[PDB]
């Protein structure tokens, strides 16, 4: 019954990466937890294929699909993410990193960063840090 939010912000629990290469897996774990899909974090790491190069967006999406979520990857400019995004979603960050985007309010983006916890990013900084790649999720039958 839990749907993505299209209007305000999604309430998403904070999960920290246990080490630096795990951000992809921590970010999908938070998305799974929003939909109450209980999957051990160790399993998520392995299903995302965490390696010495972190994870990649194709593998994050494939792992999400095996757990029953519909999953698609988009390239969006910042303004179209704000307009058409749904929450939570996973976004590529500083060409390096994955964080969970919960939504926007005022001059602020609301993120669960696996390296920092729950943070509020000023729009100007958001706009430079978001690289354009956004993984968008929807529950199963449709």
């Amino acid at each position: 019954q839990i749907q993505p939010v299209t209007r305000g912000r999604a309430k998403v629990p904070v999960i920290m990466q246990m080490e630096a290469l795990e951000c992809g897996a921590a970010s999908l774990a938070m998305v799974l937890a929003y939909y109450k899909k209980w999957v051990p974090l160790e399993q998520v790491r392995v299903d995302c294929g965490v390696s010495r190069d972190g994870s990649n967006a194709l593998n994050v999406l494939k792992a999400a699909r095996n757990y029953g979520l519909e999953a698609k990857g988009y390239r969006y400019e910042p303004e179209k993410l704000k307009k058409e995004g749904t929450f939570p979603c996973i976004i590529h960050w500083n060409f390096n990193h994955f964080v969970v985007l919960k939504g926007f309010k005022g001059k602020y983006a609301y993120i669960n960063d696996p390296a920092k916890g729950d943070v509020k990013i000023p729009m100007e900084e958001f706009d430079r840090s978001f690289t354009g790649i956004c993984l968008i999720f929807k529950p199963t039958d449709r």
Binding site: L21, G54, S55, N56, A57, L58, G73, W93, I136
Partner: peptide
């Protein structure tokens, strides 16, 4: 959505 599998495979992060 608008990205192919090979393009998504090259998007990487920790």
């Amino acid at each position: 959505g608008n990205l192919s599998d090979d393009e998504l495979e090259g998007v990487a992060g920790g």
